[PDB]
Scaffold this active site. Sequence first.
Site, mmCIF file in Angstrom:
data_model
loop_
_atom_site.group_PDB
_atom_site.id
_atom_site.type_symbol
_atom_site.label_atom_id
_atom_site.label_comp_id
_atom_site.label_asym_id
_atom_site.label_seq_id
_atom_site.Cartn_x
_atom_site.Cartn_y
_atom_site.Cartn_z
ATOM 1 N N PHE A 272 40.987 37.032 36.395
ATOM 2 C CA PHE A 272 39.986 36.758 35.361
ATOM 3 C C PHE A 272 40.405 37.227 33.970
ATOM 4 O O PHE A 272 39.888 36.724 32.968
ATOM 5 C CB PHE A 272 38.632 37.389 35.711
ATOM 6 C CG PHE A 272 38.076 36.944 37.030
ATOM 7 C CD1 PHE A 272 37.778 35.613 37.259
ATOM 8 C CD2 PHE A 272 37.841 37.863 38.042
ATOM 9 C CE1 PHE A 272 37.264 35.205 38.478
ATOM 10 C CE2 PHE A 272 37.325 37.460 39.262
ATOM 11 C CZ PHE A 272 37.036 36.132 39.478
ATOM 12 N N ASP B 141 40.306 40.625 50.938
ATOM 13 C CA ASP B 141 41.608 40.153 50.451
ATOM 14 C C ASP B 141 42.709 41.191 50.673
ATOM 15 O O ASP B 141 43.440 41.571 49.769
ATOM 16 C CB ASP B 141 41.542 39.757 48.977
ATOM 17 C CG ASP B 141 42.636 38.769 48.601
ATOM 18 O OD1 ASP B 141 43.278 38.207 49.521
ATOM 19 O OD2 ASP B 141 42.853 38.547 47.393
HETATM 20 C C1 LIG Z 1 52.374 50.594 36.408
HETATM 21 O O1 LIG Z 1 51.165 50.127 37.005
HETATM 22 C C2 LIG Z 1 51.229 48.960 37.712
HETATM 23 C C3 LIG Z 1 52.353 48.160 37.795
HETATM 24 C C4 LIG Z 1 52.307 46.995 38.543
HETATM 25 C C5 LIG Z 1 51.151 46.632 39.203
HETATM 26 C C6 LIG Z 1 50.023 47.432 39.133
HETATM 27 C C7 LIG Z 1 50.051 48.610 38.387
HETATM 28 N N1 LIG Z 1 48.966 49.505 38.374
HETATM 29 C C8 LIG Z 1 47.637 49.211 38.314
HETATM 30 N N2 LIG Z 1 46.791 50.251 38.352
HETATM 31 C C9 LIG Z 1 45.485 49.945 38.346
HETATM 32 C C10 LIG Z 1 45.011 48.631 38.292
HETATM 33 C C11 LIG Z 1 43.644 48.212 38.287
HETATM 34 C C12 LIG Z 1 43.291 46.910 38.179
HETATM 35 C C13 LIG Z 1 41.877 46.457 38.214
HETATM 36 C C14 LIG Z 1 41.391 45.860 39.373
HETATM 37 C C15 LIG Z 1 40.141 45.271 39.395
HETATM 38 C C16 LIG Z 1 39.332 45.258 38.267
HETATM 39 C C17 LIG Z 1 37.992 44.621 38.297
HETATM 40 C C18 LIG Z 1 36.839 45.351 38.543
HETATM 41 C C19 LIG Z 1 35.630 44.684 38.598
HETATM 42 C C20 LIG Z 1 35.602 43.319 38.403
HETATM 43 C C21 LIG Z 1 36.792 42.649 38.149
HETATM 44 C C22 LIG Z 1 36.818 41.176 37.874
HETATM 45 N N3 LIG Z 1 37.976 43.288 38.102
HETATM 46 C C23 LIG Z 1 39.808 45.865 37.106
HETATM 47 C C24 LIG Z 1 41.053 46.468 37.093
HETATM 48 CL CL1 LIG Z 1 41.533 47.319 35.652
HETATM 49 C C25 LIG Z 1 44.319 45.895 38.050
HETATM 50 O O2 LIG Z 1 44.075 44.707 37.890
HETATM 51 N N4 LIG Z 1 45.633 46.310 38.123
HETATM 52 C C26 LIG Z 1 46.660 45.267 38.082
HETATM 53 C C27 LIG Z 1 46.602 44.398 39.325
HETATM 54 O O3 LIG Z 1 46.968 45.140 40.467
HETATM 55 C C28 LIG Z 1 46.718 44.396 41.666
HETATM 56 C C29 LIG Z 1 47.449 43.063 41.648
HETATM 57 N N5 LIG Z 1 46.933 42.176 42.699
HETATM 58 C C30 LIG Z 1 47.302 42.389 40.293
HETATM 59 O O4 LIG Z 1 47.475 43.318 39.213
HETATM 60 C C31 LIG Z 1 46.002 47.639 38.226
HETATM 61 N N6 LIG Z 1 47.309 47.913 38.237
#
Ligand SMILES: COc1ccccc1Nc1ncc2cc(-c3ccc(-c4cccc(C)n4)cc3Cl)c(=O)n(C[C@H]3OC[C@H](N)CO3)c2n1
Length: 264
Positions: free
Chosen positions: A22, A131
């Site tokens: 998203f 998932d």
């Molecule tokens: C050096 O670090 C990294 C290097 C490489 C990959 C990951 C990290 N480290 C990381 N650490 C925390 C995360 C928290 C969220 C995160 C997750 C959900 C939401 C969220 C909450 C409520 C609603 C919604 C729509 N979303 C928000 C965030 Cl912020 C996030 O997306 N990632 C990246 C994501 O990791 C899984 C992969 N499948 C795709 O990339 C995150 N990566």
Amino acid sequence: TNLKADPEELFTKLEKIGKGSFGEVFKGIDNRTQKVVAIKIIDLEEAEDEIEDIQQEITVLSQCDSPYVTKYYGSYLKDTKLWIIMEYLGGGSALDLLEPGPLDETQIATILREILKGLDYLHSEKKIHRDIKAANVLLSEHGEVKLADFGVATPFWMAPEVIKQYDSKADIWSLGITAIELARGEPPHSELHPMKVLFLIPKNNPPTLEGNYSKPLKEFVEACLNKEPSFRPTAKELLKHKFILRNAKKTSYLTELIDAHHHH
Ligand SMILES: COc1ccccc1Nc1ncc2cc(-c3ccc(-c4cccc(C)n4)cc3Cl)c(=O)n(C[C@H]3OC[C@H](N)CO3)c2n1
């Protein structure tokens, strides 16, 4: 969701990390504590049809309080942009950590055990992750293993009953696929078009782990990948599986895997 405070004053946005759903996700700094956080920014004008799914994921994460589930710190609305603040896991995803070369069975068993600890928590809370896959398993810089990116309430990890439209046992099937993925690098059918996989998963016998792997690991996979959900074990039961007990070690040893990824 905080509608008064300015997230651009509260947080310093740094480089993009991972590949968020998203919206793009950035490493960020909490300007008050100087702790590193992960920051997802979603444009709510461009992602209008998905707002209910976004809200549902915020609600679920806000109800979780576990070492094995990525922590939710809050969200902010600035103009049209929703900022979501989460725990930063500097080791990246388990999928990223496959890149330099194959895992050994100690690493596989350790990662699966920690995933199982997260599923035990969620299932005890009457939640379903929906998932489970290596890309949604994140590691801290210390080797701690946590679940991220819950599915909304690509087919390769989906249980047959999910495709055919289930309960927590769908997570156990996905775990079995994830075990194959951690051993081989990719899930079954990864070379096929997803529309073909959609009919193959219900049609075919379940996948097995093929290759020179220990019989306990193959049996762990087979136990998860039963077409009948009631024949799959619970997460609690799998924490006592001989593959886990004989092979898993301290999570801190996974820093060696994180360091290997930095050196590749
Ligand atoms: C050096 O670090 C990294 C290097 C490489 C990959 C990951 C990290 N480290 C990381 N650490 C925390 C995360 C928290 C969220 C995160 C997750 C959900 C939401 C969220 C909450 C409520 C609603 C919604 C729509 N979303 C928000 C965030 Cl912020 C996030 O997306 N990632 C990246 C994501 O990791 C899984 C992969 N499948 C795709 O990339 C995150 N990566």
